[PDB]
Amino acid sequence: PLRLDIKRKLTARSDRVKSVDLHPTEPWMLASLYNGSVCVWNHETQTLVKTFEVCDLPVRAAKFVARKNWVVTGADDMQIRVFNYNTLERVHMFEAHSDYIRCIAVHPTQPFILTSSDDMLIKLWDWDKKWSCSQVFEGHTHYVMQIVINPKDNNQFASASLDRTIKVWQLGSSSPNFTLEGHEKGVNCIDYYSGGDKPYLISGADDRLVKIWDYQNKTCVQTLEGHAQNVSCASFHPELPIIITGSEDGTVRIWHSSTYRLESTLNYGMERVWCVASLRGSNNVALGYDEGSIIVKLGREEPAMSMDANGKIIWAKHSEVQQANLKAMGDAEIKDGERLPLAVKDMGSCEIYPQTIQHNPNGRFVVVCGDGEYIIYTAMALRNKSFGSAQEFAWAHDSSEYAIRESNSIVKIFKNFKEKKSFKPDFGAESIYGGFLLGVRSVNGLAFYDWDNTELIRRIEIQPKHIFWSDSGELVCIATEESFFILKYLSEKVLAAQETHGVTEDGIEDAFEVLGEIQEIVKTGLWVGDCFIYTSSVNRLNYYVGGEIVTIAHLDRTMYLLGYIPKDNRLYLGDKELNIISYSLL
C-alpha cells in the first residue's frame, strides 16, 4: 500500500505541450510547444525564466544537457538547434532528418545525442566532433516516435515505432539487436526500469495498452488495460515504486511497479496528455497537455517517521532522512493540539525509498523499509549497521533482535545483526508482528511464537491489522478492521506447560486471558503502563484503562501517535506534513 499524496506545484497554461524535461540541479522545467517555442519555468518561484524562439513549426523534442549548459531542440522543419541557456544564444544548428523529428535522448556519459524521426530513422550525433553523424539506425518501417538509452548499459537504447514494434539497439551496429512484437497498433512511447533487479521495458501504444517487456528473455511479461484511448506516455519513476502512464483520454494513471495495482487516476482538465518527465532524487513529475503543463509532487498520505524514548524524531522528506528535536517550551507555552517548533537537520539520502522508519525499543538503532528491502542504521549519526531484503520487518522487545518475512511463508530471526534461526509457519505468513512475542498472521488467524526457539505459544482465530504489547509484556492489544481486544499474557502458565506439558494444536491452554473487546477501529497506538492509547478511524484520540474508554481529543485531521515522554507528561503525534502536535497526559 503506497498511499501517494499528489499535490500541484505549477500550472502553466499555454498552447499544446509536446515535450517536458526537468533540470537536475536548478529548479527548472523545460516545455516544447506546438507553436515553435521552448519555455523554461522555475517550479519554486513559478516564474517563466527563459523563452527560446526555435522556429515557426512544432518542436516535438527538447532536452537539457546540464553538463554543457544547453537546451537541445528538434523541430518539424527537420533541424536540431542547440541553445546555451545562460546567454540564450543559438550555439549550433544542423539538418538532422528528412521528415519530422519526434524525439531526442542525451547520452549520460559520452558526448552524444540520439534523434528519431518520421523518416523512420534513429541517428547518433557527436557534439565533440562538430555534431557529425556517428551512426544511422535502420530497421523501422514507420515513424520512430520515441527513443530511450538503457540507464544500466549506456551503449544500448530502445525505440518505439508506429510500425507496431519496439527495437533494441547497440551504438556500434546500424541494425537492431532484436525486435519486440505484441502491440496490435502503433507504439508511441518507450522507457526503461532503472533498478538492477528487473531487465524491464515499458511501452504504450494506439491499442490503449501499456506493455511491460523483459529485454533479456525478449518477452511481454505484463499488459495493463485501463486507458480509454492512445497511450502517449509511459515511464517507471526513478525513486518511487510506480509506473506513470498518460493518455489522449486526458488521464494520468499511477500504478504500483511490482504489483501493477492502480494507485491513482488524475484528470486535471487540460485535455490530451502528451508527455511526462521525472527526475532522479526528486519527487516532482512534469506533465504536458493540449492546454499546457503542470508539475506535481508525489508525497505521502502517511509519513515515514519514528520518535525514540527521549523525543528525538527520525523521518523522511522524500528520500532524505532527517533528524528533528523539539525546541524547549514551558508548561505556560504548550497548548494541547498546537503545532510545536522543531530543529531539523539532514542526516543523509537513503539508498531505498523509505516507506517505514522504526527505532528499536531502546532507540539506539533505526530500521528503514522500502519496496522489498530494509537497512538498519545507528540512530545517533545514521551510520549503516546491516541491510537486506524482506516483505516485512519486526523488532523484538529485547533491543538488537529482529525478524524478517519472505513472501507468505518464510520467517527468519536475528541476534546482534547476525541470523540465529529460520522456520515456516503452518498456515502461511501474510504478516509478522514484533514485540514481547513474535506474531504471525495467516489465513488461519494469528499465532504467537517465542523469539528464542520459534516454538508455538498460542494460536488465536483472529485477523489483526495491529498488535501492541505493553512495556512489561503482561498486556497485548489485538486490533482488527472492526474491533480491538485487550488480553493479559500469562507467562507463568507458558513456562509451566513448557515443562509439565494443556498443549493442543493451538498451543498452551490458559496462556492468554481476554480482559475486554472494544467496538472501535485502531489506527495507531502505544502503551503507557497499563493504559493503551490509540487514534480511532473516527479521528478520536482515546485510551483504554481497566475496561473503560477515556477520550483525550477529537482531531482536526489524520494524526499518527509518535510517542509519550513521561518527564513532559506528554503524548506526541504527527501529520502527513511532518508537523508535531502534543497532548498532556497525567
UniProtKB/Swiss-Prot annotation:
Any one GO biological process: intracellular protein transport
Subcellular location: Cytoplasm, Cytosol; Golgi apparatus membrane; Cytoplasmic vesicle, COPI-coated vesicle membrane
Membrane topology: Peripheral membrane protein
Family, similarity comment: Belongs to the WD repeat COPB2 family.
Interval of the full protein contained in this chain: 2 to 588 of 906
GO CC terms, sorted: COPI vesicle coat; cytosol; endoplasmic reticulum membrane; Golgi membrane; transport vesicle
Name of the protein in question: Coatomer subunit beta'
Record's keyword annotation contains Phosphoprotein: yes
Disease involvement: Microcephaly 19, primary, autosomal recessive: A form of microcephaly, a disease defined as a head circumference more than 3 standard deviations below the age, sex and ethnically matched mean. Brain weight is markedly reduced and the cerebral cortex is disproportionately small. MCPH19 affected individuals manifest severe developmental delay, failure to thrive, cortical blindness, and spasticity. Brain imaging show a simplified gyral pattern, thin corpus callosum, slight ventricular dilation, and delayed myelination.
Result for mutant: residue 253 to C: In MCPH19; uncertain significance
Biological role: The coatomer is a cytosolic protein complex that binds to dilysine motifs and reversibly associates with Golgi non-clathrin-coated vesicles, which further mediate biosynthetic protein transport from the ER, via the Golgi up to the trans Golgi network. Coatomer complex is required for budding from Golgi membranes, and is essential for the retrograde Golgi-to-ER transport of dilysine-tagged proteins. This coatomer complex protein, essential for Golgi budding and vesicular trafficking, is a selective binding protein (RACK) for protein kinase C, epsilon type. It binds to Golgi membranes in a GTP-dependent manner.
WD repeats: 12-51, 54-93, 96-135, 139-179, 182-223, 226-265
GO MF annotations in UniProt: structural molecule activity
Lineage of origin: Eukaryota, Metazoa, Chordata, Craniata, Vertebrata
Quaternary structure and interacting proteins, as annotated: Oligomeric complex that consists of at least the alpha, beta, beta', gamma, delta, epsilon and zeta subunits. Probably interacts with PEX11A. Interacts with SCYL1. Interacts with JAGN1.
Main location: cytoplasm
Signal sequence interval, chain numbering: none
Keywords for the protein's UniProt record, in alphabetical order: Acetylation, Coiled coil, Cytoplasm, Cytoplasmic vesicle, ER-Golgi transport, Golgi apparatus, Membrane, Osteoporosis, Phosphoprotein, Primary microcephaly, Protein transport, Repeat, Transport, WD repeat
